[PDB]
């Protein structure tokens, strides 16, 4: 009787959920220790770091255990309820918007702090910066209220009455769904993508023409060598952002762009396995934003093993 149950076998399922659980534990412990560390002068970048860390901690701890509890093992008869599903996708879309806007404004603060630094001394202040943190949180909530305006419950049994056939799906029509998730992918992926990539290439270009041309001794090429390690910590953040938040948004828009005429059974199976892959990559990003901020800089490595042990 339970139709619309996909036959996903248990070996790949337990491999994916083991990847998920390892990702979750290392990501929540990393975001916990970096949030407590930044909770432990021009300190206008620590707020962006802590805000992105809190956004990653929030998306992990709110989506991921509920995600394994009612998305990979327990299929279409769910157990979280109407307010549960609507608030769950509200928090998911809000955390995605918050992580995207955190990448935007962190890259903007870096660009003002290097390529126009006197305008950062004039413009950027700790008070304003806290105002911008509250502003991007309120922008995430205001852009996630259409996720409250688009979600719902829908029975898709043989007569639409069975309590083992109701799913929690976008209940709006295909066109308005297209529009909301297309502006979702457009803003919350592409404008972060071009903004973070353009400003990080300009910052890396300014650093490379500051250490190569040098307008003096480079200091036996030691501090500028770790400045090229800073080029690595720039480029690694931007490539991690694009390579993690690209396929999730491609999967959202391939859910929008197909209207059952291009779906087959194998493409249904491939869509569900690709959904496990893209949410694996989202939890990858949620784990390796604090891991990228921790491991590649040895001072963070020492102080966080001092926090751990």
């Amino acid at each position: 009787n339970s139709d619309l149950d996909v036959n996903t076998d248990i070996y790949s399922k337990v491999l994916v959920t083991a990847i998920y659980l390892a990702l979750f534990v290392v990501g929540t412990v990393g975001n916990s220790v970096t949030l407590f560390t930044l909770a432990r002068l021009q300190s206008t970048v620590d707020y962006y770091l802590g805000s992105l860390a809190l956004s990653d901690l929030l998306i992990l701890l709110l989506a991921m255990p509920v995600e394994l509890y009612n998305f990979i093992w327990v299929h279409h008869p769910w157990a979280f309820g109407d307010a549960g599903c609507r608030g769950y996708y509200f928090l998911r879309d809000a955390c995605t918007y918050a992580t995207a806007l955190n990448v935007v404004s962190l890259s903007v603060e870096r660009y003002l702090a290097i390529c126009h630094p006197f305008k950062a001394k004039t413009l950027m202040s700790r008070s304003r910066t806290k105002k911008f943190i509250s502003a991007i949180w309120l922008a995430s909530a205001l852009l996630a209220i259409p996720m409250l305006f688009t979600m719902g419950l829908q029975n898709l049994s043989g007569d639409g009455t069975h309590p083992g056939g109701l799913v929690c799906t976008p209940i709006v029509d295909t066109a308005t769904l297209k529009v909301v998730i297309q502006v979702n992918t457009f803003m919350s992926f592409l404008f972060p993508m071009l903004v973070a990539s353009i400003l990080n290439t300009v910052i890396a270009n300014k650093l490379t023409v500051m250490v190569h041309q040098a307008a003096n001794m480079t200091i036996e090429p030691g501090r500028v060598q770790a400045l090229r390690r800073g080029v690595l910590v720039l480029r690694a953040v931007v490539i991690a952002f694009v390579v993690c938040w690209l396929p999730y948004h491609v999967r959202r828009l391939m859910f929008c762009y197909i209207s059952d005429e291009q779906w087959t059974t194998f493409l249904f199976d491939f869509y569900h396995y690709f959904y496990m892959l893209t949410n694996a990559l989202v939890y990858v990003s949620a784990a390796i934003n604090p891991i990228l901020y921790n491991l590649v800089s040895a001072n963070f490595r020492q102080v966080f093993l001092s926090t751990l042990a």
Partner: peptide, 6 residues
């Protein structure tokens, strides 16, 4: 046969 999970 359209997927429902987003």
């Amino acid at each position: 046969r359209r997927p429902y999970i987003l």
